């Protein structure tokens, strides 16, 4: 009698990314057609990225009449676990966040695969004749998410060198060594925090000049505001998926802009988070496939459990309809392929400036095209 779906969110509520609010904004819009079954979305908070803790959560979702599971978006381990269970339950899993170390398979992801992210950074260096590369890896996973990139080019001081940042050790000696090897191109890989920090103690070394060129793999670039660290000659590229083509985009940013200093006014509002963006379109994609599956086969959800070895009969069915999806959300064209990755989407390469951002180029899922 209703279209339910769980959403394991690990985001906070006080000055967070605004994911719990992103889902609500989506459900309201869906229930604005009047005329069928409603659309409900259950929220399942997570505390710490732990397999153990997540397993207990799934045994509370199965008993309910769910159709799909969203997130986590910032919980690598807690994400892989949900996929494994969703696989032995035929309950689709809309992954939208981390991705490491890719047997039972049954799930699709909106977040750009580690293949496209590495291929994008590779196409950018292409227009520069592949200068002296020097990625500033922030962690160990930095090698997996950019696997296709590291293997692509030779590893040396003249082609591509990798330097990892030790914890509680900061980006100090690093940039220094880069200057020694007369390296110009630098590709940092980390969250919005370390991305702002690495460039901070960098600009105070002449590393902010037009002589150097940086490439941020972090998708939280449009929200990453650099005030007092950038110049007019600086070169700091980035990535984005926010498609202004969506008329609801302006209204979306409005909700988060006010809600920010309405609950946690202890800081300013950076900008629409990528996490919330994926969550929004996600809910639509689910209800979209179910809408089509409710046209061919009557859809009935029967309570499952961790103890019972039962599966959702309309599992594999909905999985095919979550493959032929065509939704235009706050992230561009939402389409999937065989494996279940997102394709036929654009990847606008933004570049910071004296005030705001400037789309210097765009990367497609087949060819690059800047300027």
């Amino acid at each position: 009698s209703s279209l339910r779906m769980a959403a394991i969110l690990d985001d906070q509520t006080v000055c967070g990314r605004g994911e719990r609010l992103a889902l609500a904004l989506a459900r309201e819009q869906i229930n604005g057609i009047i005329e069928k079954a409603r659309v409900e979305v259950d929220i399942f908070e997570l505390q710490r990225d732990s397999q153990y803790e997540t397993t207990d959560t799934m045994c509370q979702i199965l008993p309910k009449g769910v159709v799909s599971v969203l997130g986590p978006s910032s919980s690598p381990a807690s994400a892989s676990t949900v996929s494994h269970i969703c696989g032995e339950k035929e309950i689709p899993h809309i992954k939208v966040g981390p991705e490491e170390t890719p047997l039972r398979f049954a799930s699709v992801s909106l977040y750009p695969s580690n293949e496209d992210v590495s291929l994008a950074v590779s196409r950018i260096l292409k227009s520069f004749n592949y200068p002296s590369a020097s990625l500033i890896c922030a962690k160990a996973e930095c090698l997996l998410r950019l696997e296709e990139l590291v293997r692509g080019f030779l590893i040396s001081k003249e082609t591509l060198s990798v330097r990892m940042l030790d914890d509680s050790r900061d980006p100090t000696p690093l940039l220094k060594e880069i200057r020694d090897d007369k390296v110009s191109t630098i590709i940092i890989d980390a969250n919005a925090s370390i991305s702002h920090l690495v460039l901070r103690k960098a600009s105070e070394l002449g590393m902010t000049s037009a002589f150097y060129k940086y490439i941020l793999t972090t998708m939280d670039f449009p929200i990453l505001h650099l005030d007092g660290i950038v110049e007019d000659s600086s070169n700091i590229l980035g990535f984005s998926m926010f498609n202004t083509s969506h008329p609801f985009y302006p209204e979306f940013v409005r909700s988060l802009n006010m809600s920010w200093r309405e609950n946690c006014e202890a800081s300013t509002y950076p900008g629409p988070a990528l996490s919330a963006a994926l969550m929004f379109d996600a809910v639509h994609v689910v209800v979209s496939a179910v809408r089509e599956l409710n046209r061919s086969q009557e859809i009935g959800v029967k309570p499952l459990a961790c103890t019972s070895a039962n599966i959702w009969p309309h599992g594999t069915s909905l999985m095919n309809y979550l493959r032929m999806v065509e939704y235009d959300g706050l992230t561009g064209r939402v389409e999937f392929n065989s494996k279940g990755q997102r394709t036929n989407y654009t990847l606008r390469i933004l570049e910071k400036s004296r005030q705001g951002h400037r789309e210097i180029g765009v990367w497609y899922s087949n060819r690059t095209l800047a300027m």
Binding site: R48, R151, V162
Partner: protein, 381 residues
């Protein structure tokens, strides 16, 4: 009085018990009939077998084991599977002994677990010490898709600090037959190669190299596998190609060779068919670490008589009483076992300090040409 240990061993196509589980049933059977360790204490255990690539079941199995009351938990021997048990343990403050490497997230906030397998981060340094030793200018590390190249992070850092042009290449995890891979290598004069894979996958590549004619004195392969010694290098020992690797098993000791000797007088797992190229008669390091995984803990428990196996319950309970402590006794315990001397780090808990034995491929076969260790550097001969 008696103590109940853990036990989680995945099924195997071989027989009722795998070489892994046998090492455990053999370790907890020697300590009993030996006053050298645990004099007035008898040991028991609860066997809990699970499926391969299955972590969900692995969670309910490990949890059920805590329900019967246990002091520690051994196995499983899989990345994902053991990764789940590790969390359930650190959640209920129950020691989790591990005898195999697994992809551990850098955000690991756990504290109740110990790995006896040589830390790959500290083992990679041993590889680099050989690269610079042979005045290598270039090199091509070829890892298996089974695991990311994070396990070889230290090797990828060399090109930055040290002077070395490293090149990355992936082995077809699908089948051992990868002609095209060895092809491009011979086209790029890639004589220096470093294979990162078990003795199974490694032997599957050597057979290919010989068919590629890449087995000559021009080439020199370095393997990360600690089961190098247990590799039939008969068809190659006459060629001329050099091969180097490591061996943690201290076979240069009577007390060590004595145990392994009695191990071959039990097979159970019939020797694998002569196809892959494995020299039958030598115990695998996978089972060696499991034999030492029981001793390293049997010494930490002997010095802690005040301990009663409580019946915990995952999903909803409180940490084990004598847990936070019994774990500290293990991260400080030392033991001279088969895999040399055991010593866990005083921080991360991982075993980054150990003793390896450099081995090369001479006209006779595989002989030791030196040793290695984190404390000293390299002592060759």
């Amino acid at each position: 009085h008696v103590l109940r240990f853990g036990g989680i061993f995945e099924y195997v196509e071989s027989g009722p018990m795998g070489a892994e589980e046998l090492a455990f049933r053999f370790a907890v059977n020697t300590i009993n009939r030996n006053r050298t360790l645990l004099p007035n204490t008898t040991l028991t255990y609860d066997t809990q077998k699970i499926n391969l690539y299955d972590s969900f079941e692995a969670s309910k199995k490990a949890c059920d084991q805590l329900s019967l009351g246990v002091a520690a938990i051994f196995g499983p021997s899989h990345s994902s599977s053991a990764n789940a048990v590790q969390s359930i343990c650190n959640a209920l403050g129950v020691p989790h002994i591990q005898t195999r490497w697994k992809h551990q997230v850098s955000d690991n906030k756990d504290s109740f677990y110990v790995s006896l397998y040589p830390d790959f981060s500290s083992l990679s340094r041993a590889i680099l010490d050989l690269v610079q030793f042979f005045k290598w200018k270039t090199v091509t590390v070829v890892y298996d898709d089974s695991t990311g190249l994070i396990r070889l992070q230290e090797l990828i850092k060399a090109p930055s600090r040290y002077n070395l042009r490293l090149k990355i290449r992936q082995l077809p995890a699908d089948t051992k037959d990868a002609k095209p891979l060895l092809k491009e290598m011979k086209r790029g004069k890639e004589f220096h190669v470093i294979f990162d894979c078990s003795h199974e996958m490694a032997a599957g590549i050597l057979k290919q190299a010989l068919a590629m004619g890449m087995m000559t004195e021009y080439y020199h392969y370095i393997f990360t596998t600690l089961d190098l010694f247990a590799l039939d290098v008969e068809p190659y020992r006459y060629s001329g190609v050099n091969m180097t690797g490591f061996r943690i098993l201290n076979t240069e000791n009577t007390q060590v060779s004595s145990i392994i000797e009695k191990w071959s007088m039990e097979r159970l797992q019939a020797p694998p068919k002569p196809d892959s190229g494995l020299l039958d008669g030598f115990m695998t390091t996978d089972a060696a670490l499991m034999y030492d995984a029981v001793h390293v803990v049997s010494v930490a428990v002997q010095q802690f008589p005040q301990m009663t196996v409580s019946s915990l319950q995952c999903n909803r309970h409180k940490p084990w009483r004598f847990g936070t402590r019994f774990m500290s006794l293990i991260k400080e315990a030392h033991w001279e076992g088969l895999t040399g001397r055991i010593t866990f780090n005083k921080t991360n808990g991982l075993r980054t300090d150990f003793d390896l034995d450099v081995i090369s491929l001479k006209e006779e076969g595989l002989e030791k040409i030196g040793t290695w260790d984190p404390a000293s550097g390299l002592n060759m001969t």
